[PDB]
Structure formats: C-alpha cells, structure tokens
Amino acid sequence: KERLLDELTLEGVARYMQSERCRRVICLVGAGISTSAGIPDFRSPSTGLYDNLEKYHLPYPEAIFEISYFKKHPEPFFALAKELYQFKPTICHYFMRLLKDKGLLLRCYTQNIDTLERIAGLEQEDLVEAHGTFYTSHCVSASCRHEYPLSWMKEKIFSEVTPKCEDCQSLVKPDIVFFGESLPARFFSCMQSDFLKVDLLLVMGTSLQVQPFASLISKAPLSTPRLLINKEKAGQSDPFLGMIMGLGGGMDFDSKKAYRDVAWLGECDQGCLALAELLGWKKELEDLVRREHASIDAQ
Amino acid sequence: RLLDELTLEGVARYMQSERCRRVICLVGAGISTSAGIPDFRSPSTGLYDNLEKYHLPYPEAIFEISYFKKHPEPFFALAKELYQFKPTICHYFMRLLKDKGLLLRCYTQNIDTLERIAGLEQEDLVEAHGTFYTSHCVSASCRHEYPLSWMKEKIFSEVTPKCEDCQSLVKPDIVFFGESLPARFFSCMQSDFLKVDLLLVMGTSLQVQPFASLISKAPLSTPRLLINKEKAGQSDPFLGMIMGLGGGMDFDSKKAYRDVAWLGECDQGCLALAELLGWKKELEDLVRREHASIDAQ
Ligand SMILES: Nc1ncnc2c1ncn2[C@@H]1O[C@H](COP(=O)(O)OP(=O)(O)OC[C@H]2O[C@H](O)[C@H](O)[C@@H]2O)[C@@H](O)[C@H]1O
Ligand SMILES: Nc1ncnc2c1ncn2[C@@H]1O[C@H](COP(=O)(O)OP(=O)(O)OC[C@H]2O[C@H](O)[C@H](O)[C@@H]2O)[C@@H](O)[C@H]1O
Ligand SMILES: [Zn+2]
Ligand SMILES: [Zn+2]
C-alpha cells in the first residue's frame, strides 16, 4: 500500500506515466468509450439502451440479455440484433493503440462487443473481450456446442430466421455473454497473470455495474494507481444494500484516506486528448485518428 | 491449515482447542423458518414467490427504495399483513456461544428480533439490515425520527405515513435496496474481522451485498462453517454473479482447506455440533426453559 502519485490529478498520473516505474498499463473499458462514435451505452438515462426497450415488452430490460428469458423468448434479442447491426473508433480507442505502440499496454479488458478495439489497431494478444463477441456463434446445448460462423448468423438475423442447430436443432447464439452465462476462459487465464505486476489501471466509459468485471479493479496491487476517465464517478459509493462492488473493493477518490485513485469527469475523448498533451503525444494522436478514419472512409 | 478434516467433527475439535477464542456468526432468514417465519428466496414457500397480489415488476421492488417512493402502498400492506414467534434452537445455540465467552459478534440480516428475544444483547449484535423499532423520514434534509407506536398506528389504521414536517414518506429503519446500512455495521466490521477464529454462517443464501462480502473479510486461515439446507457462496463465476471474484466459499475443490458445508436444517446442525461439543443437554434445557418463560405472558 504505497502512494506513487505526487498528487491525485491527471497531471500527477501523467508524471507517473513518464516515470520508469510505470511500464505496464491495463485498460478497463465499457460502452462509454463508444458513445462518441454513435453507439449508445446501456445505463445512461433516456439515452441508454435499457431505457429504450419498451416495444419488446420485457419484465425488465436486462431480460433481453438474460439466458433463461432468451431460451424462452429469443425473438426479441434477434429483433434488436438486426435493428442494431458501421462505426469508426474514437480518440479513446486510438489512445489505447498509442499505449500499445509505445510499449505500455499490457492488456485491454473490454466489456464491449463493437470490435472498435481491433479496428483501432489492437491485436488479439492485447485484448480480453470480457463479454464475448459476435464473430463466432455456438449451439447452446453443452453436448453439441456446434460452432457457426458470422456469415451464417447474419443470414439468420436479417433473414429474420431464428437460428437453430442444423445438428441438434437447439438454439444458436453469438458468443456474447448473457446474464447467468460464464465468461470466456481467456478472461481468467489473462487476469491471474496480468494483475500481479501492473503499474497503472486506466478505467474508461464504464459504470462498473456488473460482476465479475467490476472485481478487476480490486485485483491490482494496492500501490497501483487507478485513473477513471468518465462522465460520472463510478466505483465510489458508500455501502448500500444491493451494491455491485464488494465491500472495500471499489474506488476511493475523495475520502481523507484517498491515495491512488483519480477521477477525471468528462468525455473519454477529451480526457485522452488532455493526457496525451500532458504526455506530448497530442499531435501524434490527432494524426493517427485523421489517418485511420481517412483510410476507413476509403472502403 | 487449522482444521484436521473438513467436517463438522473437525470444526468441533477445532472449537474445543485453545486457538478458537472468537466466533463470528453470520445469519439470515433460514434460521427463523423453523419458527414459522418464511425466508425470502426458497421456491414457492419464500416470500418473493408470494407477492403476486401486489403486481410488482419484480418482488425485490417491494423492498426497493425507488419503487417505494413511487408506489408505497404494497409495502405497508405487507407490513401489517406480516406484523408472534419464538427463537429456535439455532438462536439459543448462539446464546450458548455468548454464555461461554466464544461469541465475538452475530451479524444478522434479519429484522424479526429473535436474536434479542433469544437473549443476545445490543453489543453482541449487528443488525445489518436494520430494525422496525425506529422509523425516519426519507428526506436527507429532514430525517425526522418517529417511534414504533407512530408507525403501528399508521399501518394498522391503513394510513400511509407522511412526515409531519415535510409531508414526505416515513419508513421503519429496515434496510431497503438502494439504502445505506447502519454505520455500526462497518465500525464493528473493521475491528471484528481482524480477530475472528471461526465464521459460522447459517440460514442465508449469500445473494446480497454488502453482507455477502463479510466472508471475504476474515483471515484466510480462519475456518468457515456453513449450516444450511443448500450450499451457498460456492459458484462458478458468471455474468451477474453477486459474489466478488474469488470472494466466495470453496467446499469441494482440490484446493479446499477451510470451508465446510453441513447441509440440513439449522436446528439439527446446531444440535449435532452441540453434541460433538458436549453441550447438547445444556442447549435443550436452555430452549425448554426460555420457551416456558415466554409462554408465561
Ligand atoms: N461519451 C462518453 N464519454 C465519457 N463517459 C461516457 C460517455 N458515454 C457514456 N459514458 C459513461 O460511461 C458509463 C457507461 O455505463 P454503462 O452504459 O452501464 O456501460 P457498461 O459498458 O459499463 O456496461 C457493462 C455491461 O452492462 C450490460 O449489461 C452489458 O453486459 C455490458 O457489458 C456511464 O457511467 C456513462 O456516464
Ligand atoms: N430451516 C432451515 N434450516 C436450514 N437452512 C434453511 C432453513 N430454512 C431456509 N434455509 C436456507 O436459508 C437460506 C435463506 O435464504 P434467503 O431466503 O435469501 O434469506 P437471506 O437472509 O439470505 O436474505 C438476505 C437479504 O435478502 C433480502 O433482500 C433481505 O434484505 C434479506 O436481509 C436459503 O438458502 C434456504 O435454503
Ligand atoms: Zn447443436
Ligand atoms: Zn420529513
């Protein structure tokens, strides 16, 4: 339990990052880093997806990604799946690409399934897609588990055909993680190793409202500084009934005892630009975004 | 490793040793079922399966602070509909721990007061999910306290309570979803869990935070005995899990070292351990005496 930051501010963190002790950075990201791109997050008021599902007549919004409700009524999820089937990465994404190219990125653990991380240039080794992906789909039966490709899933989706296994006739779904579902093994293999020697955590665009992902901030050493770049504070709350975080497993930005957590409130993109400038990468970042976006438009 | 075998017998042997000086009990609604009080989440019998008459979006809503401010009628309806019972053998076993200087603390999620009626004192107790005894206005600015008498009159009168000052809702200090827990929970927690030699967990599903976190707060060497109808706290990780990652029980893996599950009724598990400890007759005599006294208006 050591304080490495000279001051609990973005500036202090930048200074720390340009030190030699800071070699390994883990990024923890959610849907907030993609809103600037046109993709809605989940729990933002009025705007968020969970406030926009009335037409599916769910008992509650999370039901649409809940494995039991799904097996019982899979039609809504696939309707929503086609209703929301291109986007470009954000400055946040390319800031993470920069971290990678500057040899500071041990890993990015993401809750998103938009693939903007890959598109931003991150490779699979760099990525833990904590909540799955659409690229591959599987028959839900544990015996069968027959794999099916993205082309097949699309066909079924836009063909408005509820996918079934050609073999067992069971339901087939994309390997995105539903509530009640187990997370990809890679999530666990990479976590056991990654968090033992991490020098900085960068949390961005997440409300930290789901487990086990929320536990990740607790897995880092107590000395490891943690910076949240988010429109609102997350992970900091007094203990209340139904809280997601484990007791003492959250962030401490403001208490008298606060020593390693820093909260920059605003758009992810602007926090990333600010940090870059403090680091001296602002024009390199800008040029990376203009170039990549340009190269994208050409396609 | 402190337990010689992961069995009730190994726990009893450990408890008779000199290394077991302080015991913390963690209890839930399952320790009160044998007295006629239903739990929350047991299928069909549990309360959350018996709230259809209130037409809730989900059962927990009836104890959720937001739905409550929007729709306070169902709660009070239930509050009078569920407004006497006697403590069970499990409660008196905890009283027995108290009488033998082994009980550091009992943390309870229950609000039925059978722990007090059973003979536990305020200092022995952490009522983690509050109490019906006192009631407060929901406004943080107001926070006008009201007595049990006030709340009863209002409830049995079918009168939705309002604050005399701000006209906002008034509710008993039982902890709803979204509500902060009593400060004493955290103050007692910080000190208690540095010096606990045994966790005894009874009659809870460990499905709500921050109470579920308490098992992770104990030292890694401290044995943990669950006495419950079903195994609790031991699950593979999944999206939506309540437990923090690695914060649960390990009864059955190859790496298990300290956690033991005794599956059955709480009263029978307490009788079995008592027997093992040589306290069974003393326990049965305590229960008989105190129940007799109770019957005596
Ligand atoms: N443009 C932005 N700039 C900065 N912060 C933002 C921005 N947009 C949103 N935020 C903040 O970003 C946060 C977004 O909160 P949430 O929408 O809950 O997204 P999640 O990724 O954490 O959801 C996790 C899981 O929940 C689901 O069940 C799925 O399983 C998901 O995988 C909020 O604090 C916003 O204020
Ligand atoms: N007679 C019995 N003997 C042994 N175990 C029993 C018995 N009866 C029930 N059980 C077990 O007892 C366990 C009771 O499970 P739950 O019904 O969730 O009660 P909680 O106290 O943990 O609820 C915690 C909070 O949740 C609410 O929101 C309130 O806020 C509560 O404070 C089950 O596993 C049964 O198998
Ligand atoms: Zn199949
Ligand atoms: Zn008031």
Side-chain angles (χ1 to χ4, degrees), chain A residues 1-19 21-84 87 89-289 291-298, chain B residues 1-69 71-81 84-157 159-280 282-296:
Chain A
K1 167 123 59 181
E2 307 171 9
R3 169 152 177 173
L4 299 180
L5 303 180
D6 66 47
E7 68 170 351
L8 306 186
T9 66
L10 196 68
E11 291 78 19
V13 179
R15 280 194 281 281
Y16 174 79
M17 287 175 68
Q18 52 192 203
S19 77
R21 196 187 165 124
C22 188
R23 284 189 298 185
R24 279 185 278 255
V25 176
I26 297 174
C27 287
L28 308 171
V29 299
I33 69 163
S34 286
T35 50
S36 74
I39 307 166
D41 72 8
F42 292 89
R43 300 174 179 78
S44 291
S46 296
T47 81
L49 175 67
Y50 285 153
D51 207 50
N52 293 284
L53 296 163
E54 304 88 18
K55 76 189 67 161
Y56 298 109
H57 308 105
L58 307 167
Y60 50 87
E62 291 98 345
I64 197 155
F65 302 133
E66 176 191 321
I67 186 71
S68 284
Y69 188 97
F70 169 70
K71 290 179 180 161
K72 193 158 153 203
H73 340 263
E75 293 89 19
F77 164 80
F78 288 121
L80 177 68
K82 85 156 166 183
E83 161 167 280
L84 300 186
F87 301 95
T90 74
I91 297 168
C92 187
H93 292 80
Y94 292 117
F95 177 85
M96 287 193 293
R97 163 79 172 270
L98 222 59
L99 290 168
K100 164 190 173 63
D101 285 344
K102 298 240 156 205
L104 280 166
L105 186 65
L106 172 56
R107 205 87 71 193
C108 169
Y109 288 79
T110 186
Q111 296 170 100
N112 302 339
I113 62 173
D114 55 37
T115 75
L116 299 181
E117 296 97 2
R118 299 176 190 164
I119 297 174
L122 295 192
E123 289 172 292
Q124 288 170 359
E125 302 171 296
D126 307 303
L127 266 178
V128 174
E129 295 168 333
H131 292 174
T133 171
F134 241 100
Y135 195 61
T136 60
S137 302
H138 280 99
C139 169
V140 296
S141 183
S143 69
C144 188
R145 291 301 293 168
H146 191 15
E147 186 167 313
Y148 286 83
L150 183 61
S151 54
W152 187 78
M153 180 51 64
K154 300 215 309 188
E155 182 272 331
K156 292 301 204 144
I157 288 189
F158 304 108
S159 303
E160 280 104 337
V161 182
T162 306
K164 291 278 176 60
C165 189
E166 286 154 4
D167 292 18
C168 72
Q169 270 298 301
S170 303
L171 273 166
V172 185
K173 69 171 264 294
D175 301 337
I176 70 168
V177 178
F178 281 21
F179 281 103
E181 278 196 316
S182 37
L183 280 75
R186 171 170 175 80
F187 168 83
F188 303 98
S189 51
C190 285
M191 182 204 70
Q192 288 168 267
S193 63
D194 285 352
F195 280 83
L196 299 175
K197 299 187 293 174
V198 41
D199 305 310
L200 176 68
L201 291 191
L202 182 57
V203 188
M204 304 189 294
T206 174
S207 58
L208 296 176
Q209 287 296 101
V210 306
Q211 290 285 8
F213 197 94
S215 297
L216 292 185
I217 63 171
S218 85
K219 288 309 201 189
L222 308 175
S223 64
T224 297
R226 305 183 297 192
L227 168 67
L228 174 71
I229 299 182
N230 206 60
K231 268 183 178 177
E232 66 187 359
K233 289 185 178 169
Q236 189 169 239
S237 284
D238 296 276
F240 66 90
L241 182 63
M243 60 196 298
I244 302 298
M245 283 291 178
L247 199 48
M251 307 272 255
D252 182 14
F253 301 118
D254 299 321
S255 85
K256 49 149 175 173
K257 314 206 199 237
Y259 74 104
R260 61 148 167 178
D261 297 329
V262 174
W264 195 93
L265 301 189
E267 301 246 331
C268 291
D269 294 348
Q270 266 299 328
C272 282
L273 289 173
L275 195 47
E277 186 145 18
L278 286 175
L279 295 170
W281 308 346
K282 179 144 167 174
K283 196 187 113 62
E284 181 181 357
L285 181 52
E286 285 177 347
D287 290 329
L288 175 59
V289 178
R291 280 171 181 145
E292 286 279 36
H293 280 169
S295 356
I296 289 160
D297 282 323
Chain B
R1 155 156 171 176
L2 297 176
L3 303 181
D4 60 51
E5 66 176 4
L6 307 189
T7 59
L8 200 64
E9 290 73 22
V11 178
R13 283 195 287 279
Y14 171 70
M15 291 173 70
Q16 292 292 35
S17 75
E18 294 296 296
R19 172 66 187 271
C20 187
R21 299 149 298 197
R22 288 167 297 275
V23 178
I24 295 177
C25 289
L26 303 175
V27 296
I31 67 162
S32 290
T33 54
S34 66
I37 308 163
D39 69 18
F40 296 93
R41 296 175 182 82
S42 283
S44 323
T45 51
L47 185 162
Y48 284 150
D49 266 355
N50 295 279
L51 296 165
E52 299 95 8
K53 88 175 67 163
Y54 296 98
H55 308 104
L56 308 162
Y58 47 83
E60 298 100 353
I62 195 157
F63 304 122
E64 182 184 346
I65 192 75
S66 48
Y67 189 95
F68 170 73
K69 288 181 182 156
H71 298 115
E73 295 93 16
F75 168 71
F76 288 113
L78 177 66
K80 87 154 164 185
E81 165 167 281
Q84 272 289 87
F85 302 89
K86 301 180 204 176
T88 82
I89 293 169
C90 176
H91 290 85
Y92 289 113
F93 180 84
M94 291 194 287
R95 162 81 168 270
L96 219 59
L97 292 172
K98 173 187 167 66
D99 289 356
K100 299 193 179 284
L102 285 165
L103 187 66
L104 172 64
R105 203 86 66 191
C106 164
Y107 289 75
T108 187
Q109 297 166 97
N110 300 343
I111 49 83
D112 54 30
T113 77
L114 299 180
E115 296 96 7
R116 283 290 286 100
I117 301 177
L120 294 194
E121 292 166 21
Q122 283 186 354
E123 299 91 358
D124 304 312
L125 266 172
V126 176
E127 295 170 337
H129 292 174
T131 178
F132 219 100
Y133 189 59
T134 60
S135 309
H136 275 90
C137 181
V138 301
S139 176
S141 322
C142 182
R143 292 296 292 174
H144 191 26
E145 186 161 311
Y146 290 86
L148 182 53
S149 328
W150 194 83
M151 183 56 55
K152 301 204 291 190
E153 194 272 326
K154 294 276 173 164
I155 295 164
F156 298 121
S157 300
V159 180
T160 302
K162 300 276 179 66
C163 184
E164 282 160 15
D165 293 8
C166 69
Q167 288 304 305
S168 296
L169 283 166
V170 184
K171 66 166 269 290
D173 298 343
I174 61 172
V175 183
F176 277 15
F177 285 98
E179 282 191 309
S180 291
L181 273 75
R184 172 175 173 78
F185 171 86
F186 314 95
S187 56
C188 282
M189 190 287 290
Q190 271 304 327
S191 67
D192 285 344
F193 280 82
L194 292 177
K195 51 172 158 168
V196 55
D197 297 303
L198 176 69
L199 286 185
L200 181 53
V201 183
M202 302 187 292
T204 164
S205 55
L206 297 181
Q207 286 284 273
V208 305
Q209 295 280 8
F211 196 91
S213 294
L214 292 181
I215 64 171
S216 72
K217 288 314 197 188
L220 302 173
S221 62
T222 287
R224 307 188 291 196
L225 169 66
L226 175 71
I227 303 181
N228 208 51
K229 265 176 182 177
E230 66 182 352
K231 296 184 172 171
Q234 189 178 252
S235 284
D236 295 293
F238 61 91
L239 182 65
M241 61 191 286
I242 297 301
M243 282 291 183
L245 206 52
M249 296 286 208
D250 186 13
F251 304 117
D252 300 320
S253 85
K254 55 145 167 286
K255 283 191 193 279
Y257 72 102
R258 65 147 176 175
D259 299 333
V260 177
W262 198 92
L263 302 182
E265 290 257 323
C266 283
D267 292 345
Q268 280 302 326
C270 286
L271 283 168
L273 189 48
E275 171 68 354
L276 288 175
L277 300 167
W279 306 351
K280 179 149 165 178
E282 182 177 351
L283 173 57
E284 287 176 339
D285 289 342
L286 180 60
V287 175
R288 239 185 294 97
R289 279 183 175 159
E290 292 289 313
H291 274 182
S293 164
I294 287 161
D295 284 335

